[PDB]
Ligand binder design. Structure first.
Ligand SMILES: *C(=O)[C@](NC(=O)[C@H](C(=O)O)c1ccsc1)(OC)[C@@H]1N[C@@H](C(=O)O)C(C)(C)S1
Length: 502
């Protein structure tokens, strides 16, 4: 006859900003319309105007009400503007009710779609930060007591038994200015090279903060009608790859820490191949005999790094890679984040020793690679990763000795600045450091990973471009130019003083 029931009071989802307070996700007030069929059934002459207001066929609308004439609740539509919300309310139909709800808008849209993420139809987080910090952002909902009659007509609002608590504001580590630069330059590299996909990550080597994370393809998270799923992949965090030659500096770190190698030591790489039973190690350029350790990185000799790997043992290389976080949990607690794999064999045969040392037989993400380079640039100290603005920097872990990291930094500066090096990664006005890669998946992954300024490193960056088709595929020519252009702008946006001085 008269029954007490409780209706959920939706809560306003917390504002997401970039590190500078620019809005990235905002809760917009929407109006949801529900109906009591049992009441609607007493006012059928109003139905047609309501169907039209909801853009529905009059017969399909009517059929649906009749089919649910037993129920006391149905959604009519979720998530109208309050202006179109009022339109339907004006129609004054018995048994139509309104709930005030919230809809996310993403001001920056596709520029930061993967990082910021997406909410489902219930305003819960579903991809990216929205998912990872859903508990922070969501906000516990409210409860109001209503009286209903036996037909389920809402007679009376009685009281609020639990206040809605709004979700909490969250400032990302992302800098929208760098995020826009990275986005623009990665899109243009994708189109210039007719490539299938790519990622670019920018990290603060001192604070562990991710300043930019971008992927192609991307999508407009404000356009909830397409949802092409391949464009929704946050590739920087969920696509694993063999990193190939971008891990040679970690091989070189193991070599320098072994006590068996100094930078001026020499390896004979002639004739640019080496038989390992069934396997044959090949250098792309084979006009070399004696190379020093720096030369082995400038020419990316697989023969040279392999011979060093045989001398020092796979264990020492595995150890460095594990300590800098290759194939390791990032601690970011993004659900569905990929960890890849760094297989720890007890002893390694020669084949597996060589392939590890030049970046096959492990799987990593662009974010792990960027983090690893961050530790190398930060004098061998790994600072924990963050996707949220860091006020108080947590203690880092010394994973490579400062002398060794300093020495390898210098070698990577030579990889960029030396005769026959990756000149396309040069950053006019600054000393930049890094290493190119070109990985087989004929299908190629183009890689460049590095940091700047070499004098006092601030920024680590990774560029991954999947299946370039138009103009070659070497990391040194496809990805290096992107690193150059994004590092040119990012350093200046952060007011990092040019270090290419007397
Ligand atoms: C590292 O990435 C690199 N890559 C290769 O040797 C490739 C392979 O595995 O066959 C490759 C050779 C020709 S095209 C792809 O060594 C494991 C070397 N580093 C690359 C780079 O710096 O971009 C080279 C110079 C292409 S070879």
């Amino acid at each position: 006859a008269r029954s007490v029931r409780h209706i959920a009071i939706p809560a306003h989802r917390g504002l997401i900003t970039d590190r500078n307070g620019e809005p990235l996700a905002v809760s917009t007030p929407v109006t949801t319309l529900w109906a009591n069929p049992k009441e609607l059934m007493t006012a059928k002459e109003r139905w047609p105007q309501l169907a039209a207001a909801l853009g529905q066929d009059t017969k399909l609308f009517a059929d649906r009400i009749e089919q649910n004439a037993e129920r006391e609740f149905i959604y009519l539509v979720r998530g109208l503007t309050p202006e179109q919300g009022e339109g339907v309310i004006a129609l004054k139909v018995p048994g139509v009710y309104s709930i005030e709800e919230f809809r996310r808008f993403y001001p920056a849209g596709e520029v930061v779609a993967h990082a910021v993420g997406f909410t489902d139809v219930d305003d819960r987080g579903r991809e990216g930060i929205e998912l990872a910090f859903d508990e922070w952002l969501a906000g516990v909902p409210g409860k109001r007591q209503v009286l209903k009659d036996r037909r389920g007509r809402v007679i009376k609002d009685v009281q609020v038994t639990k206040n809605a608590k709004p979700g909490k504001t969250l400032a990302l580590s992302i800098d929208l200015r760098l995020q826009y630069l990275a986005h623009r330059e990665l899109r243009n590299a994708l189109l210039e090279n007719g490539a299938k996909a790519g990622s670019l990550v920018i990290m603060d080597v001192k604070t562990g903060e991710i300043l930019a994370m971008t992927n192609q393809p991307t999508y407009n998270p404000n356009n909830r009608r397409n949802l092409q799923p391949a464009a929704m992949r946050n590739r920087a965090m969920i696509d694993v790859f063999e990193p190939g030659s971008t891990v040679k500096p970690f091989s070189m770190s193991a070599a320098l820490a072994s006590g068996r190698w100094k930078p001026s030591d020499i390896v004979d790489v002639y004739p640019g191949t080496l038989q390992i039973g069934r396997y044959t190690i090949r250098d792309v350029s084979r006009n070399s005999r004696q190379l020093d350790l720096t030369g082995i990185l400038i020419k990316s000799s697989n023969v040279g790094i392999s011979k060093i790997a045989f001398d020092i043992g796979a264990e020492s290389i595995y150890s460095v890679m594990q300590q800098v976080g290759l194939g390791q949990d990032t601690g970011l607690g993004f659900p569905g984040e990929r960890v890849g794999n760094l297989p720890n064999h007890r002893k390694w045969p020669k084949a597996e020793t060589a392939t590890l040392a030049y970046g096959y037989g492990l799987s990593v993400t662009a974010i792990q690679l960027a983090h690893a380079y961050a530790a190398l640039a930060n004098d061998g100290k790994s600072v924990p990763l963050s996707m949220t603005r860091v006020d108080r920097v947590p203690d880092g872990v010394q994973v490579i000795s400062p002398e060794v990291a300093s020495t390898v930094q210098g070698m990577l500066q030579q990889v960029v600045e030396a005769q026959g090096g990756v000149f396309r990664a040069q950053v006019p006005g600054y000393h930049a450091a890094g290493k190119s890669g070109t990985a087989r998946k004929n299908a190629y992954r183009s890689l460049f990973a590095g940091f700047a300024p070499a004098t006092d490193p601030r920024i680590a960056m990774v560029v991954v471009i999947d299946e370039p088709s138009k103009a070659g595929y070497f990391g040194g020519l496809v990805s290096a130019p992107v690193f150059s252009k994004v590092m040119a702008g990012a350093l200046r946006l952060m007011n990092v003083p040019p270090d290419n001085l007397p």
